Amino acid sequence: MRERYELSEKMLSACNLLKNTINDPKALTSKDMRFCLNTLQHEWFRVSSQKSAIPAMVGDYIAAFEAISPDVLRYVINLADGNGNTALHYSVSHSNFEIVKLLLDADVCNVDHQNKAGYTPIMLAALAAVEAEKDMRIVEELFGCGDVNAKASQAGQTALMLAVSHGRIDMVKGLLACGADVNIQDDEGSTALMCASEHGHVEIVKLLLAQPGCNGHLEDNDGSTALSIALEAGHKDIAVLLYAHVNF
């Protein structure tokens, strides 16, 4: 058997103090707890969220928190820093998918939490570097735990739109396969399909078009369709694919 990483004395102390005040909102927001809570947060982010975070150490911390109290586990895992980021945001963004998996396994993450920038961990996953087959299953696990159709505070973009705009075909297939709606329009009326036509992703256009109920007729706020956009972007091959679709 492997000897588990233990919480630092500062962290154990803070967590035991938290356990004893967590159900008392007066105590929790008081001056007397401020140093405790800052220490708690400081330690958790140092251990869980740096690029060089040790996955085993994070997993052992999670177990240690649960053993102290399930309420302590929920509390720490869901801490957001001053950028509004949780450990789930940072671990998705650093492509540290071992840690992403350990966090989902705790079954307490607020996976729909929007950071200050306005994005959820699912949106961040759309742009993350996925190297292995194992990692994509972890990503699809993430998609299944949250709302894949949530809209960013910035322009109302979805994870699907972000994945399309980057040409990440792996990722688009994942989102679609976990229930991402093709027809959602951002704040300006733009669809995923329109994103695909701006960026010239012919393979992604074919994939979106192949989805049941994919609407090529939708117009953005200035009456532009995917077809009208495609022609202006110079993408003849996309335009003929789009034209055949809206006239099938």
Partner: peptide, 15 residues
């Protein structure tokens, strides 16, 4: 428009 922008990993993470 947002549909034409290429958003980076860091634009998603930090305001």
């Amino acid at each position: 428009k947002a549909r034409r922008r290429t958003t980076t990993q860091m634009e998603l993470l930090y305001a």
